[PDB]
Design an enzyme around this catalytic site. Structure first.
Site, PDB file in Angstrom:
ATOM      1  N   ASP A   1      54.521  47.093  33.192  1.00  0.00           N
ATOM      2  CA  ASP A   1      53.920  48.057  34.155  1.00  0.00           C
ATOM      3  C   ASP A   1      52.539  48.501  33.653  1.00  0.00           C
ATOM      4  O   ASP A   1      51.655  48.628  34.500  1.00  0.00           O
ATOM      5  CB  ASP A   1      54.822  49.285  34.395  1.00  0.00           C
ATOM      6  CG  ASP A   1      55.888  49.112  35.463  1.00  0.00           C
ATOM      7  OD1 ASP A   1      56.091  47.952  35.943  1.00  0.00           O
ATOM      8  OD2 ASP A   1      56.492  50.158  35.858  1.00  0.00           O
TER       9      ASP A   1
ATOM     10  N   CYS B   1      48.826  38.636  42.744  1.00  0.00           N
ATOM     11  CA  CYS B   1      49.477  39.792  42.081  1.00  0.00           C
ATOM     12  C   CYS B   1      49.502  40.907  43.127  1.00  0.00           C
ATOM     13  O   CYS B   1      49.713  40.578  44.298  1.00  0.00           O
ATOM     14  CB  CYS B   1      48.819  40.100  40.732  1.00  0.00           C
ATOM     15  SG  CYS B   1      46.986  40.116  40.733  1.00  0.00           S
ATOM     16  N   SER B   2      49.131  42.144  42.806  1.00  0.00           N
ATOM     17  CA  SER B   2      48.947  43.136  43.883  1.00  0.00           C
ATOM     18  C   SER B   2      47.571  42.970  44.561  1.00  0.00           C
ATOM     19  O   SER B   2      47.536  42.828  45.792  1.00  0.00           O
ATOM     20  CB  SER B   2      49.170  44.582  43.384  1.00  0.00           C
ATOM     21  OG  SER B   2      49.394  45.426  44.523  1.00  0.00           O
ATOM     22  N   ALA B   3      46.470  43.045  43.803  1.00  0.00           N
ATOM     23  CA  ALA B   3      45.102  42.918  44.387  1.00  0.00           C
ATOM     24  C   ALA B   3      44.607  41.458  44.387  1.00  0.00           C
ATOM     25  O   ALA B   3      43.680  41.165  45.153  1.00  0.00           O
ATOM     26  CB  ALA B   3      44.139  43.816  43.651  1.00  0.00           C
ATOM     27  N   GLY B   4      45.226  40.568  43.619  1.00  0.00           N
ATOM     28  CA  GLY B   4      44.771  39.168  43.469  1.00  0.00           C
ATOM     29  C   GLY B   4      43.491  39.020  42.650  1.00  0.00           C
ATOM     30  O   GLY B   4      42.763  38.060  42.931  1.00  0.00           O
ATOM     31  N   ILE B   5      43.249  39.857  41.650  1.00  0.00           N
ATOM     32  CA  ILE B   5      42.033  39.701  40.773  1.00  0.00           C
ATOM     33  C   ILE B   5      42.362  39.811  39.288  1.00  0.00           C
ATOM     34  O   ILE B   5      41.642  39.191  38.453  1.00  0.00           O
ATOM     35  CB  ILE B   5      40.912  40.675  41.228  1.00  0.00           C
ATOM     36  CG1 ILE B   5      41.294  42.148  41.112  1.00  0.00           C
ATOM     37  CG2 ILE B   5      40.494  40.355  42.631  1.00  0.00           C
ATOM     38  CD1 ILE B   5      40.163  43.104  41.440  1.00  0.00           C
ATOM     39  N   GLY B   6      43.333  40.635  38.888  1.00  0.00           N
ATOM     40  CA  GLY B   6      43.586  40.924  37.470  1.00  0.00           C
ATOM     41  C   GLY B   6      44.490  39.906  36.792  1.00  0.00           C
ATOM     42  O   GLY B   6      43.970  38.967  36.172  1.00  0.00           O
ATOM     43  N   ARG B   7      45.818  40.039  36.919  1.00  0.00           N
ATOM     44  CA  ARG B   7      46.773  39.011  36.423  1.00  0.00           C
ATOM     45  C   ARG B   7      46.415  37.638  37.007  1.00  0.00           C
ATOM     46  O   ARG B   7      46.504  36.621  36.268  1.00  0.00           O
ATOM     47  CB  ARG B   7      48.207  39.420  36.793  1.00  0.00           C
ATOM     48  CG  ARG B   7      48.591  40.769  36.204  1.00  0.00           C
ATOM     49  CD  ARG B   7      49.963  41.204  36.645  1.00  0.00           C
ATOM     50  NE  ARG B   7      50.174  42.591  36.345  1.00  0.00           N
ATOM     51  CZ  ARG B   7      51.274  43.286  36.690  1.00  0.00           C
ATOM     52  NH1 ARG B   7      52.264  42.699  37.364  1.00  0.00           N
ATOM     53  NH2 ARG B   7      51.361  44.572  36.353  1.00  0.00           N
ATOM     54  N   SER B   8      46.101  37.569  38.289  1.00  0.00           N
ATOM     55  CA  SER B   8      45.760  36.302  38.997  1.00  0.00           C
ATOM     56  C   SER B   8      44.561  35.650  38.300  1.00  0.00           C
ATOM     57  O   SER B   8      44.555  34.412  38.112  1.00  0.00           O
ATOM     58  CB  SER B   8      45.454  36.594  40.459  1.00  0.00           C
ATOM     59  OG  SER B   8      46.644  36.973  41.207  1.00  0.00           O
TER      60      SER B   8
ATOM     61  N   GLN C   1      40.472  42.546  35.200  1.00  0.00           N
ATOM     62  CA  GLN C   1      40.253  43.963  35.648  1.00  0.00           C
ATOM     63  C   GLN C   1      40.000  44.894  34.460  1.00  0.00           C
ATOM     64  O   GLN C   1      39.507  46.027  34.717  1.00  0.00           O
ATOM     65  CB  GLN C   1      41.461  44.477  36.440  1.00  0.00           C
ATOM     66  CG  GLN C   1      41.451  44.046  37.890  1.00  0.00           C
ATOM     67  CD  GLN C   1      42.608  44.679  38.643  1.00  0.00           C
ATOM     68  OE1 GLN C   1      43.766  44.260  38.528  1.00  0.00           O
ATOM     69  NE2 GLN C   1      42.308  45.729  39.389  1.00  0.00           N
TER      70      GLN C   1
END
Ligand code: A1ABE
Length: 284
Positions: A181, A215-222, A262
């Site tokens: 998290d 992911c949620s926004a599609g920029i960090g983990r992605s 991010q």
């Protein structure tokens, strides 16, 4: 400069926040005018995360062609990725329309449906074989075929039917279920194991449309997933693997979608994953 030495130099100097801000400063800025049209407000999860106009995926319909999704085309590595937000209740039908139209084989999901007590994306796939999902707005049917649950991830076999033509395709769903998290994983071993399972499936190969990654926004983990995959592929291809510059690969990818990676901790984790993964690529 061998990234492993660059790594120890940044770590001993504690300058991760400084390197990260330098990337943010040099990153491309292109227009996102379609994303900001009033008709598209309920198609965006986050007001500050939009696809550039030049690289956005278009839906094949005259009504409204808009989805929050970008094509990342890596010319030297010969890999393409579609990065997208976690689907919203009113975009689950658009999501599966895109998978169908782009001829994708794989969907890579790096978040849980609920994290930090809040919904991060819609429940967009069926949880039981005998309870299929019909998307009336795009004329698609989705059925769960099989589910393999492991300690760090789950793989699912899905059947997507175009109800208009009665063609069907097998889609593979790769769900990384253990990203914490807060912060980033302590070791990249489980994330690299996962990346190698997606590669082994054929989902990233040029005989298919681009993999869909969210992911949620599609920029960090992605961002971390595609950056690690591309850097390891370039280390395989080049005469001099020590010439691979992770900061330069990230800026190239940011020409196609804003905000990739991010936090300074996500940048440090991407370095760790590439350094540990190279100990396979270079013959072990
Ligand atoms: O994808 C499908 O629609 C499908 C239908 C029946 C069997 C299988 C299957 C996969 C591996 C062994 O059997 C797959």
């Amino acid at each position: 400069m061998e990234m492993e030495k660059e790594f120890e130099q940044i770590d001993k100097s504690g300058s991760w926040a400084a390197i990260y801000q330098d990337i943010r400063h040099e990153a491309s800025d292109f227009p996102s005018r379609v994303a900001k049209l009033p008709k598209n407000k309920n198609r965006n999860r986050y007001r500050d995360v939009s696809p550039f106009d030049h690289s956005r995926i278009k839906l094949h319909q005259e009504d409204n062609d808009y989805i929050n999704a970008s094509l990342i085309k890596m010319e030297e590595a010969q890999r393409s990725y579609i990065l997208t937000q976690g689907p919203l209740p009113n975009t689950v039908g658009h999501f599966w329309e895109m998978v169908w139209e782009q001829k994708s084989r794989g969907v890579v999901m790096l978040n849980r449906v609920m994290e930090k007590g809040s919904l991060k994306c819609a429940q967009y796939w069926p949880q039981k074989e005998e309870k299929e999902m019909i998307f009336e707005d795009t004329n698609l049917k989705l059925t769960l075929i099989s589910e393999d649950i492991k300690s760090y991830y789950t793989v699912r076999q899905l059947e997507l039917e175009n109800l208009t033509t009665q063609e069907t395709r097998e889609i593979l769903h790769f769900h990384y279920t253990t990203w914490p998290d807060f912060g980033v994983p302590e070791s990249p071993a489980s994330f690299l194991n996962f990346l190698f399972k997606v590669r082994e499936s054929g989902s990233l190969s040029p005989e298919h449309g681009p993999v869909v990654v969210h992911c949620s926004a599609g920029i960090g983990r992605s961002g971390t997933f595609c950056l690690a995959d591309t850097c390891l592929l370039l280390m395989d291809k080049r005469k001099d693997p020590s010439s691979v510059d992770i900061k330069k690969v990230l800026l190239e990818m940011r020409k196609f979608r804003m905000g990739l990676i991010q936090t300074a901790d996500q940048l440090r984790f991407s370095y760790l994953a590439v350094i540990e993964g190279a100990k396979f690529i270079m013959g072990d």
